[PDB]
């Protein structure tokens, strides 16, 4: 090998030869754009965006095809390099059609992710929505009993019935989380920071809530006694109740804000105070002074502000109202303050309005409800003069308008009509015609003319240095998301700044969709929207009770359930959305005709869209080179290609196996497997690497989550990156909702909830009694094997604990390597097929597992010979040199004796290391040799290596036996890169065979029949749905104790069911087909807060058993070490397990080669079913 | 009718390569490419079926539907 | 159990042991610990030992294989050991532990049980 020498970036790098500029970017921490690159694939050069401008080189290169050479500049940035991948961009966005962010996200102003937490709360998961919101809302209950919901209005569902009731469903979980301890998003480490926010209202506290966020120490200074803003010294009682808004104040100050009240700029600090011992100050005044009524007698007493009515209302303060109140104007100012006039004694209220209704500002619901409580409208009318009498108003002029002419809105100018004047009687006048910024507490800023503070727009900073503004005070009077939004952004903004590199706020781009009409939505199901519970009129025109309440948790499921989830799956993790936003694409230029060409289908686990295809190829490269199924193609030519299973037919009617490689390979959402959850939400969630237990392939994982539910499974990257039906699909059994949580004991003759300790102790009674009456011997324990180590070794430690030596399992097959080698376990690890030189796959290798064909696939192509045995058709018979369809073990006595005949067994060796040799030449002598045996036995005579791949879980004992007798006679066992290979059935069956469980199903059964056995305890086994057969043997036991996650056919006729958790709930370490000890780590906590390990050590010591997890693992390190098979690789280096330290050579008869068995764990029987009643293979 | 393709499927076997010659052959005695023809191909030939289509509509020569 | 469910008398014990009080199980007196031990680093020495033996039958072949003391075998059956019980089984004495015996007998898959009183 050499060490190129390269340049990339201008930093040098020394790259080792036959590499990729990909692969040496990827190692050297430089970001190179791809599409349509695999590690496992060759290179395709679709998509081209991994072009890299190569010094010397005309054309821009590829980086995932070309290779370093030494003294090779490479610039992955330069404007050549920007400019191919924008154009190649916008081309891909030209043809894509999605929607990266629903409308309803794009319409609210603080984008929060509505249909994130309405699928959430579709799904139950509250606290998660609660999060969600307080990601972009800290206000969920208080924003959601009060804003205009301007997303409802771009809501989808606006074209099938009715908009998702969003303010109702945030509101509902904003109660939920006040209702117990608040939610407290986690704070990063202190950066000794220190910013000053003048205000207290929604801007200010928005602005503190995501500053705290970032470790920063904020204060804020209030003017009013309370924090709020004119969420409290505005809006009413009855339509926000204080409690609420005291109560997230208070989770804002449990961030550490401290929030100094009754503090004012400009009297009691200064601005040059907070700008000298303050990093960074954030203005929020607001508009607090309410416009004068603009008419000669505006300043008579008996005239009062609207906000500062509301404010000495919402105080408690003695105001002085009357029989007659008008009130001017037409906003959310007027609106309250003549309903709070209406509730305060007011025998007429009148608003007067210069426009018409059509115009008002006011929302049309608030209008109606003031008109159902007794206020009157008059409009098109504005005031002229105020008639005072004796200092006090006794009426007011107004002169009638009507609408002329265009104005600056550009809708319709109001304009006065001569000779129309109205005198209206007034006790109270309240000018509500709006707010502007008190020009006091903006003293020595920049102001815009219309009154406001004047900030430069993006970066929301004033004329002074490290002095920010937002919210009413520089927008004007607005509504409160408004104002949130404001303060998130000057937030971000601020904490940049802080950081030293002050950078303006840049809008992402976003895919939508704008074609959308009602007729795309003429077949979806028409659901009501949930009722509003509305106060009565009469009753609530008297008091400041709120008028409307919460929804419940059946009808907020119910309305988050009416989701049409217009948002694309894959927006967290799609890299085409990723790359447009790192790259100023204009896709407009290039927009063209584009396909529709996305039909529903019915397969329960993925789906494809054609419309948002890139045609990278990857799920055709994965499904044909990695996986060898060979399901998915290219159609049609050109502009019309696209990627379609075998000819256009569904899914489920190809051969795909469901592994769902393509929806882990495909970039941009077009292929997605679907999630195990109620309702589809895209949700960024938390990988945690754990192990499939679905066979002894343990394949590793990572399991996504959000909450205490599954979202969805992914491969790791060890490989060839690969997962099979079970591990990929199958872990929706987490989620399921027919999980037991609680123990059932049989009370009246029927099963009944309990407590654990009840039925635990019942447990034990049971089976003492058993034991007492009926002796030793008589409780059988049928373990599955899908429990860890320490679990089968603490079943074990029990049945020693009841005397009884019956532990065994149902799934368990007669053990024949014991006898032979010592030891029933695989001779060496799945690390030596890619090196051996013969491979001999007995069984359904490839059917029962994919993992394994897709290994034999990529050792066949690395220089390995295949040699498949089998009854049936193969997968693995495609590239295989020699294919044998046996059904008698007659195959291997005549493969013997030709290998006897051939002089290819060295009989001194093997006289030598195996015993028994001269009993298996005689049983040999009188077999016929037949030519496939012949060419059998010259093929393994020939390899140098050899290698026997068993699936044990369809293979015959007699066959195991005589393949490693072929194995022995040829010296092919206790080598490197030579031996047998078991992939067993379940996930530790290995585990549980060492540990102690090494009874099979029919010793089991026999000794029920028998009589000997009269109670047992089924740990996670289904025998009377697996088996109709067994039903009748189960009538024969006095006791039935179950322990299993759901209730089985074979747990209602049990007396007592104990509760088990799945595997993604329990620590504890599984072994390998091949020996290798893995993990089990956590993902989940118990949903019941009892693991298995758990239950068992309850059980445990309820007969004296002291145990804990640590014990356990070292007594099996102590276990495995004793039979020398602890972190071996390859077994038998040294010498045989066998007493004699010599191989017993399997003499017996024929019988079957291969044999069809069910399965009897609770689980993989369940999602077996399954997937025979959808029709889908594995 | 699938035992026209007989002869033609017993022409080209033995190498899975000759799958653009059976295609035409088909498409010249059925005047165009039937699914359960198709099917037959890739059941007696060997050649993965997605392939077949793959090769069938790449070309405008093959198409598939009834005269 | 059935007639004092032992999660009571665990929380009384832990009430009790929430006084102060340290209760060392598995020590005991004459073979874990001397009695000249306790005189010596304790003020003030109380034996609540209780009668821990049981009386034999009293009769030839009282120590016959399958013949169990009241007590033991109700301490047996509490703490969850196997005991050798069977169809047949007889109690000898008229006192609670002869009563208790039976009935844990009973429930414990016994046929038959007959309580023999002088
Ligand atoms: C009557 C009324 C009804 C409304 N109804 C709705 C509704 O139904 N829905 C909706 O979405 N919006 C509504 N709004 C709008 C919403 O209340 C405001 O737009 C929003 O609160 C703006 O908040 P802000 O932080 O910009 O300023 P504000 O909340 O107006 O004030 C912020 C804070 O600044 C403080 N402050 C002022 N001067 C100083 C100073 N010199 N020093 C220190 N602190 C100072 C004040 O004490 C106040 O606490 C309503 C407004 C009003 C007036
Ligand atoms: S596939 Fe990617 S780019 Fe297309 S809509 Fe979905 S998230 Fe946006
Ligand atoms: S804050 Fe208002 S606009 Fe935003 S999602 Fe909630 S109701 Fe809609
Ligand atoms: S249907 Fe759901 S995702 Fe679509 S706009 Fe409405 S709330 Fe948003
Ligand atoms: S899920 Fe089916 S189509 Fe997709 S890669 Fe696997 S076998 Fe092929
Ligand atoms: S569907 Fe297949 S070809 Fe299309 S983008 Fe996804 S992986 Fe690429
Ligand atoms: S091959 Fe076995 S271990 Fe791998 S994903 Fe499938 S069931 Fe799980
Ligand atoms: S051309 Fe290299 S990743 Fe697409």
């Known amino acids: 090998m050499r060490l190129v020498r390269v340049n990339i970036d201008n930093k040098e790098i020394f790259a080792e030869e036959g590499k990729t500029i990909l692969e040496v970017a990827h190692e050297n921490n430089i970001e190179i754009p791809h599409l349509c690159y695999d590690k496992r694939l060759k290179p395709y050069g679709a998509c081209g965006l991994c072009v890299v401008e190569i010094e010397g080189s005309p054309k821009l290169a590829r980086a995932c095809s070309t290779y370093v050479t030494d003294k090779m500049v490479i610039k992955t940035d330069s404007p050549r390099v920007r400019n191919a991948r924008k154009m190649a961009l916008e081309l891909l966005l030209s043809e894509h059609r999605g929607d990266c962010r629903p409308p309803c996200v794009l319409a609210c102003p603080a984008h929060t992710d509505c249909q994130g937490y309405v699928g959430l709360i579709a799904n139950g998961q509250f606290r998660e929505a609660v999060a969600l919101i307080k990601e972009q809302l800290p206000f969920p209950a208080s924003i959601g009993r009060v804003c205009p919901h301007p997303c409802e209005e771009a809501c989808r569902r606006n074209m099938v019935d009715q908009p998702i009731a969003i303010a109702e469903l945030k509101r509902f979980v904003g109660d939920i989380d006040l209702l117990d301890d608040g939610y407290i998003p986690p704070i990063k480490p202190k950066t000794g920071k220190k910013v000053a926010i003048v205000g207290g209202g929604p801007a200010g506290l928005t602005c503190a809530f995501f500053l705290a966020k970032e470790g920063h120490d904020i204060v804020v200074y209030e003017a009013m006694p309370k924090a709020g803003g004119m969420l409290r010294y505005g809006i009413p009682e009855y339509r926000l109740p204080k409690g609420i808004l005291d109560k997230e104040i208070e989770l804002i100050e449990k961030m550490g804000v401290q929030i100094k009240t009754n503090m004012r700029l400009g009297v009691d600090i200064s601005l040059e105070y907070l700008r000298k011992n303050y990093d960074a100050v954030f203005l929020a005044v607001g508009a607090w002074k309410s416009s004068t009524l603009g008419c000669p007698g505006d300043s008579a007493e008996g005239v009062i502000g609207g906000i500062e009515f509301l404010r000495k209302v919402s105080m408690n303060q003695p105001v002085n109202l009357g029989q007659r109140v008008l009130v001017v104007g037409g906003g959310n100012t007027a609106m309250d303050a003549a309903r709070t006039a209406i509730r305060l004694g007011a025998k007429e209220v009148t608003v007067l309005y210069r426009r018409t209704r059509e115009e008002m500002p006011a929302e049309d619901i608030e209008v109606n409800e003031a008109e159902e409580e007794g206020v009157k409208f008059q409009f098109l009318v504005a005031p002229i003069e105020v008639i005072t009498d004796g200092g006090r108003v006794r009426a007011l002029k107004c002169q009638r308008m009507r609408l002329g002419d265009m104005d600056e809105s550009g809708r319709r100018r109001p304009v006065p009509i001569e000779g129309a004047e109205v005198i209206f009687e007034a006790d109270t006048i309240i000018s509500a015609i709006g707010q502007k910024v008190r020009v006091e507490d903006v003293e020595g800023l920049e102001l815009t003319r219309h009154g406001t503070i004047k900030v430069d727009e993006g970066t929301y900073q004033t004329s002074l240095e490290g002095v920010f503004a937002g919210g009413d005070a520089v927008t004007g009077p607005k509504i409160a998301i408004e104002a949130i939004?404001?303060?998130?952004?000057?937030?971000?903004?601020?904490?940049?700044?802080?950081?030293?590199?002050?950078?303006?706020?840049?809008?992402?781009?976003?895919?939508?969709?704008?074609?959308?009409?009602?007729?795309?939505?003429?077949?979806?199901?028409?659901?009501?929207?949930?009722?509003?519970?509305?106060?009565?009129?009469?009753?609530?025109?008297?008091?400041?009770?709120?008028?409307?309440?919460?929804?419940?948790?059946?009808?907020?499921?119910?309305?988050?359930?009416?989701?049409?989830?217009?948002?694309?799956?894959?927006?967290?993790?799609?890299?085409?959305?990723?790359?447009?936003?790192?790259?100023?694409?204009?896709?407009?230029?290039?927009?063209?005709?584009?396909?529709?060409?996305?039909?529903?289908?019915?397969?329960?686990?993925?789906?494809?869209?054609?419309?948002?295809?890139?045609?990278?190829?990857?799920?055709?490269?994965?499904?044909?080179?990695?996986?060898?199924?060979?399901a998915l193609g290219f159609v049609n030519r050109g502009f019309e290609t696209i990627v379609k299973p075998e000819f256009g037919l569904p899914l489920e009617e190809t051969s795909c196996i469901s592994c769902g490689q393509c929806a882990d390979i495909c970039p941009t959402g077009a292929c997605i497997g679907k999630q195990p959850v109620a309702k589809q939400v895209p949700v960024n969630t938390v990988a945690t690497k754990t192990v499939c237990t679905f066979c002894g392939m343990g394949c590793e994982m990572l399991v996504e989550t959000k909450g205490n539910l599954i979202f969805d499974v992914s491969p790791v990257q060890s490989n060839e990156g690969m997962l099979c039906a079970f591990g990929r699909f199958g872990i929706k059994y987490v989620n399921d909702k027919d999980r037991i949580l609680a123990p059932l004991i049989k009370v009246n003759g029927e099963l009944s909830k309990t407590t654990f300790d009840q039925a635990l102790i019942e447990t034990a009674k049971k089976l003492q009694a058993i034991r007492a009456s009926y002796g030793k011997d008589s409780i059988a324990i049928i373990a599955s094997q899908r429990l860890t180590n320490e679990e089968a070794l603490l079943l074990t430690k029990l049945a020693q604990k009841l005397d009884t030596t019956v532990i065994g399992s149902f799934d368990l097959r007669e053990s024949v390597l014991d006898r032979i080698f010592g030891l029933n376990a695989s001779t060496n690890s799945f690390d030596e097929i890619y090196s051996t030189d013969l491979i001999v796959a007995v069984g359904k290798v490839a059917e029962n597992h994919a993992v394994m064909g897709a290994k034999?696939?990529?050792?066949?192509?690395?220089?390995?010979?295949?040699?498949?045995?089998?009854?049936?058709?193969?997968?693995?018979?495609?590239?295989?040199?020699?294919?044998?369809?046996?059904?008698?073990?007659?195959?291997?006595?005549?493969?013997?004796?030709?290998?006897?005949?051939?002089?290819?067994?060295?009989?001194?060796?093997?006289?030598?290391?195996?015993?028994?040799?001269?009993?298996?030449?005689?049983?040999?002598?009188?077999?016929?040799?037949?030519?496939?045996?012949?060419?059998?036995?010259?093929?393994?005579?020939?390899?140098?290596?050899?290698?026997?791949?068993?699936?044990?879980?369809?293979?015959?004992?007699?066959?195991?036996?005589?393949?490693?007798?072929?194995?022995?006679?040829?010296?092919?066992?206790?080598?490197?890169?030579?031996?047998?290979?078991?992939?067993?059935?379940?996930?530790?069956?290995?585990?549980?065979?060492?540990?102690?469980?090494?009874?099979?199903?029919?010793?089991?059964?026999?000794?029920?029949?028998?009589?000997?056995?009269?109670?047992?305890?089924?740990?996670?086994?289904?025998?009377?749905?697996?088996?109709?057969?067994?039903?009748?043997?189960?009538?024969?036991?006095?006791?039935?104790?179950?322990?299993?996650?759901?209730?089985?056919?074979?747990?209602?006729?049990?007396?007592?069911?104990?509760?088990?958790?799945?595997?993604?709930?329990?620590?504890?370490?599984?072994?390998?087909?091949?020996?290798?000890?893995?993990?089990?780590?956590?993902?989940?906590?118990?949903?019941?807060?009892?693991?298995?390990?758990?239950?068992?050590?309850?059980?445990?010591?309820?007969?004296?058993?002291?145990?804990?997890?640590?014990?356990?693992?070292?007594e099996m390190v102590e276990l495995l070490q004793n039979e020398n098979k602890y972190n071996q690789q390859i077994l038998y280096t040294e010498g045989f397990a066998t007493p004699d330290k010599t191989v017993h050579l399997f003499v017996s008869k024929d019988a079957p080669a291969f044999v069809e068995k069910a399965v009897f764990d609770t689980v993989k029987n369940r999602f077996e079913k399954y997937l025979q009643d959808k029709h889908l293979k594995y | 009718d699938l035992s026209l393709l007989d002869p033609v499927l017993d022409e080209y076997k033995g190498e899975k390569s000759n799958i653009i010659a059976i295609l035409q052959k088909t498409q010249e005695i059925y005047r165009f490419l039937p699914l359960d023809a198709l099917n037959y191909i890739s059941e007696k030939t060997g050649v993965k079926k997605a392939k077949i289509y793959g090769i069938a509509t790449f070309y405008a020569q093959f198409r598939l539907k009834p005269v």
């Open chain 1, 856 to 1114: 034999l696939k990529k050792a066949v192509e690395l220089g390995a010979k295949l040699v498949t045995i089998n009854n049936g058709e193969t997968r693995a018979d495609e590239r295989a040199i020699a294919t044998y369809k046996i059904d008698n073990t007659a195959f291997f006595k005549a493969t013997i004796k030709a290998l006897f005949e051939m002089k290819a067994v060295d009989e001194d060796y093997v006289s030598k290391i195996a015993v028994n040799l001269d009993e298996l030449k005689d049983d040999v002598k009188n077999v016929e040799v037949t030519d496939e045996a012949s060419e059998f036995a010259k093929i393994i005579a020939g390899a140098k290596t050899a290698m026997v791949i068993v699936d044990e879980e369809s293979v015959s004992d007699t066959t195991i036996g005589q393949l490693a007798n072929i194995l022995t006679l040829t010296q092919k066992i206790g080598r490197p890169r030579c031996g047998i290979i078991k992939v067993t059935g379940l996930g530790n069956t290995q585990g549980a065979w060492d540990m102690g469980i090494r009874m099979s199903k029919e010793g089991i059964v026999k000794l029920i029949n028998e009589g000997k056995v009269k109670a047992a305890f089924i740990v996670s086994e289904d025998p009377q749905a697996a088996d109709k057969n067994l039903g009748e043997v189960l009538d024969k036991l006095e006791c039935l104790i179950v322990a299993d996650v759901f209730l089985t056919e074979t747990g209602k006729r049990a007396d007592v069911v104990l509760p088990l958790v799945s595997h993604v709930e329990s620590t504890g370490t599984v072994t390998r087909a091949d020996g290798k000890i893995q993990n089990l780590n956590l993902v989940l906590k118990p949903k019941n807060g009892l693991s298995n390990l758990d239950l068992l050590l309850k059980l445990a010591e309820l007969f004296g058993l002291q145990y804990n997890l640590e014990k356990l693992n070292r």
């Open chain 1, 485 to 630: 939004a404001q303060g998130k952004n000057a937030a971000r903004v601020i904490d940049s700044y802080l950081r030293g590199k002050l950078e303006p706020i840049k809008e992402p781009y976003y895919v939508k969709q704008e074609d959308l009409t009602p007729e795309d939505f003429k077949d979806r199901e028409r659901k009501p929207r949930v009722p509003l519970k509305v106060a009565n009129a009469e009753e609530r025109k008297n008091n400041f009770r709120e008028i409307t309440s919460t929804m419940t948790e059946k009808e907020a499921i119910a309305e988050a359930s009416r989701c049409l989830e217009c948002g694309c799956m894959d927006y967290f993790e799609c890299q085409l959305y990723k790359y447009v936003n790192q790259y100023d694409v204009d896709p407009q230029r290039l927009s063209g005709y584009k396909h529709k060409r996305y039909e529903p289908q019915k397969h329960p686990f993925i789906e494809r869209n054609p419309d948002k295809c890139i045609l990278c190829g990857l799920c055709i490269r994965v499904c044909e080179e990695v996986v060898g199924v060979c």
